[PDB]
Design a protein around this ligand. Structure first.
Ligand SMILES: *[C@@H]1O[C@H](CO)[C@@H](O[C@@H]2O[C@H](CO)[C@@H](O[C@@H]3O[C@H](CO)[C@@H](O)[C@H](O)[C@H]3NC(C)=O)[C@H](O)[C@H]2NC(C)=O)[C@H](O)[C@H]1NC(C)=O
Lengths: 93, 96
């Protein structure tokens, strides 16, 4: 797709889980079930505005579910809870 | 002949070592388990992958699997306790 420097997919949303966080635990799986309803709004948002970039939900669990789905970028040390946009919204200055 | 006369001492030593093995079983039964990384304190969260820092340096990380491992010389049952106490009595690896 153009306006995207990589391969994407509007069919669903991708989930990023940090290496230190085990996928398939009770905390993650419960967080990974109710977040599946975010995909409907993800597609609805793009329908109104086709020129829309990444929409991401950074969970306090640790996993980030973003749309559209796209394969992730050595080892990966990415944690959504340390990103500047997550920290600025978690608390006031 | 020297072996035959000794046996009274061997019997007492074996009995005392068996009693000490039973006491060690009562004490450290299954308590010697540990995870591959010193951050998970139970098998329920000692699963998946984790980031290991080689030689303690923060700038050299590497991905490793974490396994809920058990000590080689444990006190899980009576025979294991007897073997561990024998290795201790030989003064080898007893500080560990
Ligand atoms: C969290 O996980 C739950 C377990 O998978 C999901 O619950 C399941 O959702 C299915 C999709 O609707 C349900 O299937 C149908 O549900 C309707 C609603 O009552 C009924 O017609 C039937 O139960 C069923 N239809 C069939 C089988 O033809 C499951 O019943 C339902 N429960 C299960 C599988 O135990 C949740 O949807 C999920 N949460 C989110 C936000 O996705």
């Amino acid at each position: 797709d153009a306006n995207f420097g990589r391969q994407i997919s509007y069919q669903h949303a991708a989930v990023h889980i940090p290496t230190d966080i085990y996928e398939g635990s009770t905390i993650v799986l419960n967080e990974l079930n109710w977040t599946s309803a975010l995909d409907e709004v993800f597609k609805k948002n793009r329908e109104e505005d086709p020129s829309l970039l990444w929409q991401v939900f950074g969970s306090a669990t640790g996993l980030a579910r973003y749309y559209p789905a796209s394969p992730w970028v050595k080892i990966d040390l990415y944690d959504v809870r340390r990103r500047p946009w997550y920290i600025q919204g978690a608390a006031s200055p | 002949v020297a072996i035959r006369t000794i046996g009274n001492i061997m019997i007492v030593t074996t009995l005392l070592q068996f009693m000490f093995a039973c006491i060690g079983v009562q004490l450290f039964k299954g308590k010697f388990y540990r995870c591959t990384d010193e951050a998970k304190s139970n098998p329920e969260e000692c699963r998946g992958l984790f980031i290991l820092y080689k030689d303690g340096d923060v700038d050299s990380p590497v991905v490793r699997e974490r396994i809920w491992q058990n000590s080689d010389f444990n006190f899980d049952n009576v025979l294991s306790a007897m073997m561990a106490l024998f290795t201790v009595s030989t003064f080898e690896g007893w500080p560990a």
